[PDB]
Design a protein around this ligand. Sequence first.
Ligand SMILES: [Cl-]
Length: 158
Amino acid sequence: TVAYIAIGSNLASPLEQVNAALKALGDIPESHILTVSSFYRTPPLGPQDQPDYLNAAVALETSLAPEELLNHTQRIELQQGRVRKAERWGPRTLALDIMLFGNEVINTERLTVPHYDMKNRGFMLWPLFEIAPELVFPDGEMLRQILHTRAFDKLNKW
Ligand SMILES: [Cl-]
């Protein structure tokens, strides 16, 4: 099954973090990376005196069950990133999100796929569109139609 995974880092110096994350994704058993999007840049949320986000999408071929893949993305998040000590409930430094898992729809305590908000997020949709322009969501909606109708601004490359 092809899983699509979003990578997002908010480190002031995110490159090695993202490259290490890609290495780790490629080390996941029963899986291999099919392709990786370009690296994109998005602005911080709220105050602008914060670091930009580095965003990318990864297509991963896997024979793991969705929850098993989640185990690995969670592990990689723990091993390669951290919480902010002042805002521990907040976002981690490295985020790996399973955007799509084949054509599967999943709604469990641990896992919701497709990612619940991805259709509203250009920073997820554009890198995905670079590596899977013909993608159709499980509900039948076309990625091309979402980007076109909703008129997202494009993202700058990292
Ligand atoms: Cl869907």
